[PDB]
């Protein structure tokens, strides 16, 4: 015989504690310090492989070129730090929430990182 088993919500629960390691700052190999014009500078430590799984350009930033081992500090410009936080959380919890006055900026931030499931969610909200 051949017995097979598939835990359905495993990916839901596995992502649940990958978010714990991000908040507890464990196993992190990238630090996204993002500074925006007329905005307080911020820092978000995350995991390269889990951000690569949610964004093709996050995947491209970390897979090619000469990357720093251990932990790589990445300077990011162009998006507000309060928008990058919305994107990183979506990459860890598969959900995103905000007010009606920021869905435009979050859409532009999600287009740059090609998180297409968010650019279509922000588009369906504005219709």
Ligand X SMILES: *[C@H](CC(=O)OC)C(=O)OC
Residues that bind ligand X (CB under 6 A): 80, 82-83, 86, 98-99, 102, 105-106
91 binds, among ligand X, its own copies, none (CB under 5 to 8 A by kind): its own copies
Residues 3-42 that bind its own copies (CB under 8 A): 3-8, 10-15, 17-18, 21, 26-29
Contact criterion met (CB below 8 Å) for 30 and 71: yes
Token readout for 99 is 């007010």
Nearer to ligand X, 16 or 78 (CB): 78
77 touches its own copies (CB under 8 A): no
The window from 34-42, 76-84, 91-99 that contacts its own copies (CB under 8 A) reads 91-99
Please state, in angstroms and rounded to a whole number, the distance separating the CA atoms of residues 67 and 123. Answer: 35
Question: Smallest distance, Å, CB 95 to its own copies?
Answer: 4
By DSSP bridging, strand 30-34 and strand 72-76 are: parallel
15 binds, among ligand X, its own copies, none (CB under 5 to 8 A by kind): its own copies
Please state, in angstroms and rounded to a whole number, the distance separating the CA atoms of residues 49 and 44. Answer: 15
57 touches its own copies (CB under 8 A): no
Please state, in angstroms and rounded to a whole number, the distance separating the CA atoms of residues 56 and 116. Answer: 10
By DSSP bridging, strand 42-46 and strand 30-34 are: antiparallel
């Amino acid at each position: 015989r051949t017995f097979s088993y598939t835990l359905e919500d495993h990916t839901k629960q596995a992502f649940g504690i990958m978010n714990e390691l991000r908040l507890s700052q464990q196993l992190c190999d990238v630090t996204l310090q993002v500074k925006y014009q007329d905005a307080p500078a911020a820092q978000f430590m995350a995991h390269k492989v889990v951000l690569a799984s949610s964004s093709p350009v996050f995947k491209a930033m970390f897979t090619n070129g000469l990357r720093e081992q251990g932990m790589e500090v990445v300077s990011i410009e162009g998006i507000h730090p309060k928008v990058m936080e919305r994107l990183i959380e979506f990459a860890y919890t598969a959900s995103i929430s905000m007010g009606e006055k920021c869905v435009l900026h979050v859409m532009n931030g999600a287009v740059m990182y090609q998180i297409d499931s968010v650019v279509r969610a922000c588009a369906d909200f504005l219709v």
